């Protein structure tokens, strides 16, 4: 809500193939237009963002897929295994 506008003009150069994709991914804010009632106040826009609200910015070549935090050992409840709890401190008894 309090975050700044994303300065897209810096990270994406004007008239470039990379910028275009980013633009397509994004959706713009509703501008103020004369002779119309905006019952959620008049749009306050600068660098293409509604100042009155939170901004959302949607974004080898491979998707980064993280591994499951629960394990096979955990599922089986194998007490002798070391991979059975990954988020806790295990002690040898």
């Amino acid at each position: 809500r309090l975050m700044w506008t994303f300065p897209a003009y810096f990270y994406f150069k004007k008239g470039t193939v990379a910028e275009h994709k980013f633009l397509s991914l994004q959706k713009g804010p509703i501008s103020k237009k004369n002779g119309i009632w905006f019952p959620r106040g008049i749009p306050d826009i600068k660098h293409g963002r509604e100042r009155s609200t939170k901004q959302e910015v949607k974004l080898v070549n491979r998707p980064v897929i993280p591994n499951d935090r629960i394990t096979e050992a955990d599922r089986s409840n194998d007490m002798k295994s070391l991979e059975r709890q990954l988020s806790r401190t295990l002690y040898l008894l």
């Binding site: 309090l2 810096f10 990270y11 401190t89």
Partner: protein, 274 residues
């Protein structure tokens, strides 16, 4: 002005008058910066800090265990010595300065559950010396710093003047940024994992590096900064790049304790220790 004589009058009560509160001038400023009603509000505790959590869980107990010396008493530092009163000229005399040093040194306490060493602050001093010619280089350096940290840099200016190095006084030259809390922790984690392994012949931080009291430092070249993921992702946008000094400030009594702490966070140490 009728006079320059400064002289604060004594009072007849023990109530502490906060003068700021009695005014009606700065109503937004009466709120604390932590308070939501202040324009200075910022969400502090946004997500769980990982390095800090690790320190809390694993390291802190281990550090305490390491630093236990049995019946260790306090080691007083070098202090200002008083004069022996063996002459009437000692009577309102200022005390003799410390033995070796001109400035007084702090007492070294035994490490207990309260005063275990931990990370206090990181400072990233970048003074670009080509910016004596080009002011724009200072700006670029500041941006780089901001990118690296996710924290607002502060501009460094030339405090001194010197002819040999073509340096004026009062000229913007690079930038600095004091990281604290979670951003600092993140920056350390990035340094440990991403950047320092990509440095080729990197032995580690020197064991001869540091303050006398809980402060360790090292520096990165312009070659090393291109390994930061924010800089690396747009090498077209970053043609020039500037080195930096990295002052790590710990809550350590002595420097070996600080080194040990940093090692706990996966910092390699190579040189012969003092």
């Amino acid at each position: 002005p009728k006079s320059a004589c400064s002289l604060v009058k004594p009072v007849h009560h023990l109530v502490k008058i906060d003068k700021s509160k009695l005014s009606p001038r700065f109503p937004e400023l009466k709120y604390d910066k932590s308070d939501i009603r202040s324009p200075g509000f910022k969400p502090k505790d946004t997500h769980a800090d990982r390095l800090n959590d690790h320190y809390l869980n694993t390291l802190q107990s281990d550090l305490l265990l390491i630093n236990y010396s049995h019946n260790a008493a306090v080691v007083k530092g070098l202090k200002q010595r008083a004069w022996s009163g063996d002459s009437p000229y000692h009577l309102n005399r200022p005390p003799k300065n410390p033995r070796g040093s001109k400035a007084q040194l702090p007492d070294i306490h035994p490490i207990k559950w309260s005063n275990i060493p931990g990370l206090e602050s990181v400072v990233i001093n970048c003074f670009v010396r080509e910016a004596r010619e080009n002011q724009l280089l200072a700006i670029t350096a500041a941006l780089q710093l901001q990118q690296i940290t996710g924290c607002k840099p502060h501009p460094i200016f030339s405090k001194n003047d010197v002819p040999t190095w073509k340096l004026r006084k009062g000229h913007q030259m690079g930038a600095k940024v004091e990281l604290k809390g979670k951003e600092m922790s993140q920056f350390l984690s990035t340094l440990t994992e991403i950047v320092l392994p990509r440095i080729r012949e990197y032995k580690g931080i020197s064991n001869q590096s540091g303050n006398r009291f809980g402060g360790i430092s090292f520096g990165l070249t312009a070659e090393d900064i291109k390994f930061f993921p924010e800089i690396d992702a747009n090498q077209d946008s970053w043609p020039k790049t500037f080195g930096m000094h990295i002052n790590i400030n710990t809550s350590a009594q002595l420097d070996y304790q600080a080194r040990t702490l940093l090692s706990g966070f996966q910092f390699p140490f190579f040189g012969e220790e003092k």
